[PDB]
Design a protein around this ligand. Structure first.
Ligand SMILES: [Zn+2]
Lengths: 469, 46, 116, 93, 237
């Protein structure tokens, strides 16, 4: 049987090389200079070089003569080894739900939270429910805002209304203030959004969830991506076993410190007071406000209308942020910095302006999500993330603050985003240097340094001795 | 504002504005010298 | 001959039966250069779209299949020299396969890909 | 150097004959030989005015390269088929 | 820039080496593209003793001079000695030339000597007739270009190489004295002319080897080509 020999080729022009060698084979197959090679292989995904099937290297060299595209493999050839010749012709070929939330990878809608309105059965795209970032073709010759169909009908351009549904500016589809447009599944980020996966790190205590090895707990020695071959050291066991990720879970007796790796709460820490079936409850270190999370890692009140951290209208003039959920009431941090107790129905849910802009103490533009330092007022010295803005008020969050679930309120002006004689030709009119013309480099209340035009020296004299030109 | 220059070849004072190619309106010569300044110069004779 | 060889890179299609890679002009004008007598796609474009593939991986310029181990592994030793495909995505309909089996030609798949 | 050594260097270089990729279907070449170098005095301007000689002081001031263009005349003679030889000469290349 | 003079024979004696005396003549044609192809004719520094070898360009190992002459075309031995010792009545020359003669009494004809040289070549041929051609090319062009590169210059190259060997023997016997390296008679000065010639020659070859590439890229398809586009005026300047 003949063997395969690597011949280096021009990149991106390997298929054309095989076509030219086949034409060269048929053009000289009856002549006195025959191509004694057997086949030519240029694969689909192997880029840069092709393969010649022959019993000899000299047959390869005398067959590729006259081909310029292989001239970097003309002098020497390398044989594909015998066990590896089948590797030449060898060809190889959850995380997303309806009403879940993803993040688009590109565009102005890059990194924005978007709800999955519809999963396409062909698995090409998903319809996404968004909030548009558009200037309504007025500024174009931005923060998120609700789609005003009357405004885009007023401005005109590419607009087509079909009731609440509307097509605009490149087949952008919108309905009832929200966008509903298909975007590719390869173009969206399906995991870690939190408006399978495995995360195990050496040193954590894990439990065996199934098997004859079930209910062993031990600490992680090492980690791999799938079958972790987690090498746990179980209690009272000096031996290392191997477990696949799917067989494990992150256990924890009550009283140990825990971190929230991913979720609405991620970054927060606490001691777990009670562990339930897959449920785990804990108290945060910043605030004693309760938390219930899954073992691998709700946030909404009973009734589903409101959720912690939301902006509410307390009365016609006063806004606040919900900072504690109770069975009949909320605790709300109002815009003045006081916490009030109100019945769930006594406050109205307020539309948050995610695209709000304000000025900080140094006249910088600040926006929601910005990190600011507090430089005046009661919270001076603190640092926080802007969560909401209203008139002269900013609601901030800092996870280190245990009070009010980390929320606090500051005035925007208490925040910050985290001589005449100089150069004037003078004439010394008194003293030992009298009559010299120079230029004032530095000047004070008393004296001034004069670069003398004549000498190579800068000397200082009194301002009472100088007379300008 | 005027910034009168001097042609290297024909020595002709010719008006040039900012952001224009260095060209002499006659003789096409492309090297220009600026001028002598107007501000006062005081030299000791030492 | 040269009539089997494709003329350009655009619209290259591999056959579903013998993995013969030609352009759509050559399938329209010549049919299959190996087994058109069993398939009869010459004189019909829809027969070509039913009997050729739009997805293929790897090409082989099979010059002498009588003394090729690649033709032994790809099972194309008893064929004619030409441009062949390594992996072919696609399948004939059941009428064509049943008609070939009634003529004594069982349809072996050229999809030799390792699907996961 | 610029009188005779450049001439001998430009003339002793062998002519280049070049074929196709040994066939097309189931190949002629040409010679392209050149000689008789020409050298002109330094010149300076490019697509903005009719070219003018470079003064060395102007080169110093404008950080130009006080260089001179050299020219050759090439004779490419090409044979294809039928035994008909046509040679085209390009002066001042 | 100073350099050692070309086409002249220098007999030196380096202190610590396997050989005592060595005669070199770096050679150049009349400003050819080939660099200084330096050839050394050396004498070992001590059985038999005092064999004469000649390390050759594009040859990995030293080659005894008599093998070089037989490869050059002199089958006999009297003819070879006629090119080295010019007066046969001097037996002191013979007593030192015979230790190199008796080293190579197993090569008697031109082709076996060509094979011997080709085996020592940097690119050893796989067959005999490839080493023959490689060594013939080396003797034709690499060795002693200044005495001539043509169809038949074997007699002139043999005369000059025998002169080099005679010069080495004169230094070995003490009839003459070793040439001085700092003697500025043996030096040459590369002024603007020669330096610009050396550099322009290389750039001109580089220009030609890209005109060729452009020509190939158009004639593989065979439509036509334009020498105006082929010439890359940037490279030389
Ligand atoms: Zn077929």
């Amino acid at each position: 049987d003949p063997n395969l020999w690597t011949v280096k080729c021009k990149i991106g022009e390997e298929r054309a090389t095989a076509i030219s060698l086949m034409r060269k084979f048929i053009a000289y197959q009856f002549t006195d200079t025959p191509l004694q090679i057997k086949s030519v292989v240029a694969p689909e995904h192997v880029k840069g070089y092709i393969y010649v099937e022959a019993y000899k290297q000299t047959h390869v060299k005398q067959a590729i003569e006259g081909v310029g595209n292989l001239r970097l493999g003309y002098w020497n050839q390398q044989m594909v080894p015998i066990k590896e010749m089948t590797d030449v012709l060898k060809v190889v070929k959850a995380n997303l739900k309806p009403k879940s939330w993803v993040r688009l990878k590109r565009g102005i809608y890059k990194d924005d939270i978007a709800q999955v309105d519809y999963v396409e059965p062909s698995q090409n795209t998903i319809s996404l429910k968004m909030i548009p970032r558009i200037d309504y073709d007025r500024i174009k010759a931005p923060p998120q805002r609700l789609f005003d169909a009357e405004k885009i009908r007023s401005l005109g351009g590419d607009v087509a209304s079909d009731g609440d549904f509307l097509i605009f500016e490149g087949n952008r589809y919108s309905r009832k203030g929200f966008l509903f447009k298909s975007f590719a599944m390869s173009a969206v980020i399906t995991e870690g959004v939190k408006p399978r996966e495995h995360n195990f790190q050496p040193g954590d205590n894990v439990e065996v969830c199934e098997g004859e090895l079930i209910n062993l707990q031990g600490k992680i020695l090492s980690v791999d991506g799938n079958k972790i071959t987690i090498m746990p050291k179980h209690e009272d066991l000096k031996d290392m076993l191997e477990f696949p990720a799917q067989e494990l879970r992150k256990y924890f007796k009550m009283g140990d410190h825990v971190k929230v790796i991913a979720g609405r709460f991620e970054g927060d820490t606490g001691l777990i007071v009670r562990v339930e079936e897959n449920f785990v409850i804990l108290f945060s270190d910043l605030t004693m406000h309760e938390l219930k999370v899954l073992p691998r890692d709700s946030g909404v009140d009973v009734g589903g209308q409101h959720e912690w951290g939301e902006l509410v209208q307390l009365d016609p003039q006063t806004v606040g942020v919900i900072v504690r959920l109770e069975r009949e009431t909320f605790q709300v941090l109002n815009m003045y910095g006081k916490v009030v107790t109100v019945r769930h129905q006594a406050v109205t849910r307020k539309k948050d302006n995610r695209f709000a802009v304000a000025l900080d103490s140094e006249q910088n533009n600040i926006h929601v999500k910005d990190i600011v330092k507090v430089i005046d007022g009661p919270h001076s010295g603190r640092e926080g993330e802007i969560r909401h803005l209203f008139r002269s008020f900013a609601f901030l969050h800092c996870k280190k603050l245990v009070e009010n679930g980390g929320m606090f309120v500051c005035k925007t002006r208490h925040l910050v985003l985290a001589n005449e004689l100089i150069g004037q030709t003078v004439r010394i009119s008194q003293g030992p240097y009298k009559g010299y013309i120079g230029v004032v480099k530095d000047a004070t209340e008393s004296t001034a340094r004069v670069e003398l035009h004549s000498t190579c020296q800068t000397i200082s004299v009194d301002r009472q001795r100088l007379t300008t030109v | 504002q005027p910034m009168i220059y001097i042609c290297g070849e024909c020595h002709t004072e010719n008006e040039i504005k900012s952001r224009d190619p260095i060209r002499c309106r006659e003789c096409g010569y492309r090297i220009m010298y600026k001028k002598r300044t107007k501000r006062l110069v005081v030299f000791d004779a030492r | 001959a040269l009539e089997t060889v494709p003329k350009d890179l655009r619209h290259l299609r591999a056959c579903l039966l013998c993995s013969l890679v030609k352009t759509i002009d050559q399938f329209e004008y010549d049919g299959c250069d190996n087994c058109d007598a069993y398939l009869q796609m010459k004189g019909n474009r829809e027969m070509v779209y039913d009997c050729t593939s739009s997805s293929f991986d790897g090409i082989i310029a099979m010059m002498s299949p009588e003394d090729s181990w690649v033709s032994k592994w790809q099972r194309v030793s008893n064929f004619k020299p030409g441009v062949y495909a390594v992996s072919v995505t696609g399948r004939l309909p059941q009428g064509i396969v049943r008609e070939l089996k009634s003529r004594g030609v069982a349809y072996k798949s050229r999809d030799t890909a390792i699907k996961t | 150097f610029i009188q005779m050594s450049v001439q001998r260097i430009v003339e002793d270089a062998p002519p280049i004959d070049l074929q196709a990729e040994a066939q097309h279907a189931s190949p002629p070449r040409y010679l392209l030989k050149f000689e008789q170098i020409y050298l002109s005095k330094p010149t300076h301007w490019e697509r903005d005015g009719a070219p003018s000689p470079m003064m060395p002081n102007e080169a110093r001031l404008r950080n130009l390269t006080y260089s001179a263009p050299l020219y050759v005349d090439i004779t490419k003679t090409v044979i294809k088929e039928g035994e008909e030889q046509l040679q085209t000469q390009h002066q001042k290349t | 820039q100073e350099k050692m003079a070309t086409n002249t024979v220098y007999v030196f004696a380096k202190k610590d080496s396997k050989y005592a005396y060595t005669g070199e003549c770096r050679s150049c044609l009349e400003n050819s593209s080939r660099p200084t192809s330096t050839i050394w004719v050396s004498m070992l520094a001590r059985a038999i003793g005092q064999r004469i070898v000649a390390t050759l360009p594009y040859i990995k190992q030293e080659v005894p001079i008599i093998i070089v002459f037989r490869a050059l075309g002199f089958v006999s031995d009297r003819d070879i000695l006629e090119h080295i010792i010019y007066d046969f009545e001097d037996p002191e020359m013979m007593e030192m030339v015979k230790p190199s003669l008796d080293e190579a009494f197993v090569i008697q004809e031109q082709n076996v000597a060509l094979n011997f040289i080709g085996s020592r070549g940097a690119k050893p041929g796989v067959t005999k007739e490839k080493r023959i051609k490689y060594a013939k090319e080396v003797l034709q062009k690499e060795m002693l270009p200044h005495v001539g590169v043509s169809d038949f210059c074997e007699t002139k190259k043999a005369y000059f190489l025998g002169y080099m060997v005679h010069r080495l023997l004169l230094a070995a016997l003490g009839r003459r004295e070793l040439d001085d390296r700092d003697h500025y008679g043996n030096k040459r000065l590369d002024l603007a002319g020669p330096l610009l010639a050396f550099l322009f020659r290389g750039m001109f070859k580089n220009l030609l080897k890209e005109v060729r590439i452009y020509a190939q890229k158009f004639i593989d398809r065979g439509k036509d080509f334009n020498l105006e586009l082929a010439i890359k005026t940037r490279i030389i300047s």
